[PDB]
Curated annotation (Swiss-Prot):
Name of the featured protein: Phospholipase D1
Full-length numbering of the shown residues: 336 to 1074 of 1074
Family: Belongs to the phospholipase D family.
Segments of this protein annotated with the region Catalytic: 123-430
Taxonomic superkingdom: Eukaryota
Catalytic class of the enzyme: hydrolase
Signal sequence segment: none
Keywords attached to this entry: Cytoplasm, Disease variant, Endoplasmic reticulum, Endosome, Golgi apparatus, Hydrolase, Lipid degradation, Lipid metabolism, Lipoprotein, Membrane, Palmitate, Phosphoprotein, Repeat
Tissue-wise expression: Expressed abundantly in the pancreas and heart and at high levels in brain, placenta, spleen, uterus and small intestine.
Function per UniProt: Function as phospholipase selective for phosphatidylcholine. Implicated as a critical step in numerous cellular pathways, including signal transduction, membrane trafficking, and the regulation of mitosis. May be involved in the regulation of perinuclear intravesicular membrane traffic.
Protein's GO biological process: cellular response to nutrient; chemotaxis; phosphatidic acid biosynthetic process; phospholipid catabolic process; positive regulation of translation; Ras protein signal transduction; regulation of microvillus assembly; regulation of synaptic vesicle cycle
């Protein structure tokens, strides 16, 4: 049938849905949903690490370690199906071959596929579906480094939260791991759960890929790899994710012949994103790992960055208040080294501010200097003391999140880049949630009926990044007023950025325009070391994690050197 946005799935009205800010709650609920499975567990991952703990701090021994959960459910008769991305032979990587063997050795009811063969793009969706009745969709893999809570801690010297290989730091530091010298990289991300017919929609995507891959590879043609069947739409599971509310939901994906055997590619995530931006009335809030857009229909093609610029110019033309918040990582992570990092920085900046085609280029040409009233670009950072020394690290924004108007959300695996959005490249999954239940709220000082689901999630985002967890939240209730935008959002991002720059002289920043200035810069003395008493006094004025994004880091470098589309 013909569905909205050309999705493979219909709008499911009054579906029960949940959101997650960071992995702590997500992994706990996944663990409890799996514990209650009776028939089927389906898992997809870009990377899966079998020994991660889903509940922490650890008690009850290995009861909540991922491999032990799967094994005891398989032992009860639950059939477990796992699809892993097959990384290049030359990748240091994801170790999918080892992980497959580990998993299938736990019990015969556990069946694992890897795809694609290389003798290309990737499978990027991160899904857990239980009994085709509860499904989790997000940006969070069941993998090392992902677990985090809203404190985004840099340290763990008792090994209370990140045992062994789970203590990771994927930030580039070779411009030219041991937990006693080096802080971890915190993992900031977003996920969701859906129930009922919506969950059956997630299952259908997983079944389509499973059966497609089964018939395409010799090794999976045997009876031992079951042919999967969708649960009849006529028919649930004795688990409801606590905290869920009813809303209109719709599954969306990126998929194509190579990834799912469909003849015409699907790019319904992309379509949904452009639609939500175009129809927003008050604000959009983006947290995303990448920010590669602004189409020249030669090297970049997706329409999101141009939709943003054009929505702002409409607000200006109608003399309307409209805000765009953009939170991305301060540096790209690597999980080619430095030339890979630089290529992604090229395209992120190309979308933001480098070129007349940039978002800022387009706004300037029509708005000149008034662009500051409409958009703010940020990353995340934090600090701590490690073994008597002040340290800082960026917080990796791994999210793939769009919120509009406190009433519409898109959560999934798709990054703002062509790889995720065009549909023909990496395979991806997202869900759009549109509120049907509203609460009395405020929007530019005016009475406003906000959506239960989207407002709750936007407020939790705000609390995390602005520093209002467990605090009176009056200052953050209105997401578009001059008072909030200037005195809370833009002020926090500038204040924290200034403090971190002064205390740590950390990269990235607006002073370092070329790689040779970088080397000299980092050899200069650092206050955090020279006068820690004073540094610690200055850091007491930090509130939240938000920091203003530096437009001019490696300004003068041509950040390009492998085809371009690998980076875009
Ligand atoms: P994904 O795990 O690369 O965004």
């Amino acid at each position: 049938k013909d569905h909205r946005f050309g999705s493979y799935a219909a709008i499911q009205e009054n579906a029960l849905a949940k959101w997650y800010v960071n992995a702590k709650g997500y992994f706990e609920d996944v663990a409890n949903a799996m514990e209650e499975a009776n028939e089927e567990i389906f898992i997809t991952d870009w990377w899966l690490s079998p020994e991660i703990f889903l509940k922490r701090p650890v008690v009850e021994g290995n009861r909540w370690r991922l491999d032990c959960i799967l094994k005891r459910k398989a032992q009860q008769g639950v059939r477990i199906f796992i699809m892993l991305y097959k990384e290049v032979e030359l990748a240091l990587g994801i170790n999918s071959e080892y992980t497959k063997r580990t998993l299938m050795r736990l019990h015969p009811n556990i069946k694992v596929m890897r795809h694609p063969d290389h003798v290309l793009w990737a499978h990027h969706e991160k899904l857990v579906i239980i009994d085709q009745s509860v499904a989790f969709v997000g940006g969070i893999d069941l993998a090392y480094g992902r677990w985090d809570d809203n404190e985004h801690r840099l340290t763990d010297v008792g090994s209370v939260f990140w045992h062994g290989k789970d203590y990771c730091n994927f930030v580039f530091k070779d411009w030219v791991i041991d937990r006693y010298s080096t802080p971890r990289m915190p993992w900031h991300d977003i996920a969701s759960a859906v129930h009922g017919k919506a969950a059956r929609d997630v299952a259908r995507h997983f079944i389509q890929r499973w059966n497609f891959t089964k018939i395409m590879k010799s090794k999976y043609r045997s009876l031992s790899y079951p042919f999967l069947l969708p649960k009849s739409q006529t028919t649930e599971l004795r688990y409801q994710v606590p905290g869920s509310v009813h809303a209109n939901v719709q599954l969306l994906r990126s998929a194509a012949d190579w990834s799912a055997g469909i003849k015409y590619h699907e790019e319904s995530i992309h379509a949904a994103y452009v639609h939500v931006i175009e129809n927003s009335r008050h604000y959009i809030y983006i947290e995303n790992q990448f920010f590669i857009s602004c189409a020249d229909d030669k090297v970049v093609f997706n329409k999101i960055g141009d939709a943003i610029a054009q929505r702002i110019l409409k607000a200006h033309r109608e003399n309307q208040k409209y805000r765009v918040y953009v939170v991305i990582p301060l540096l790209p992570g690597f999980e080619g080294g430095g030339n890979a990092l630089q290529a992604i920085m090229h395209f992120n900046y190309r979308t933001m501010c480098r070129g007349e085609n940039s978002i800022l280029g387009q706004l300037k040409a029509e708005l000149g200097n008034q662009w500051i009233n409409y958009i703010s670009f940020c990353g995340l950072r934090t600090h701590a003391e490690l073994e008597g020394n002040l340290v800082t690290e960026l917080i990796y924004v791994h999210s793939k999140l769009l919120i509009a108007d406190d009433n519409t959300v898109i959560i999934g695996s798709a990054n703002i880049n062509d790889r995720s959005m065009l549909g023909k490249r990496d395979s991806e999954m997202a869900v759009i949630v549109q509120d049907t239940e509203t609460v009395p709220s405020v929007m530019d000082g005016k009475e406003y009926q906000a959506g239960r689901f989207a407002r709750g999630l936007r407020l939790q985002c705000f609390r995390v990044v602005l520093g209002y967890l467990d605090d009176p939240s009056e200052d953050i209730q209105d997401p578009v007023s001059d008072k909030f935008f200037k005195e809370v959002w833009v002020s926090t991002a500038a204040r924290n950025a200034t403090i971190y720059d002064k205390v740590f002289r950390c990269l990235p920043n607006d002073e370092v325009h070329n790689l040779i200035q970088l080397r000299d810069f980092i050899n200069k003395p650092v206050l955090a070391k020279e006068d820690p008493i004073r540094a610690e006094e200055e850091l007491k004025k930090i509130r939240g994690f938000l920091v203003q994004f530096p437009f001019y880091f490696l300004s003068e470098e041509s950040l390009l050197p492998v085809p371009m589309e690998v980076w875009t």
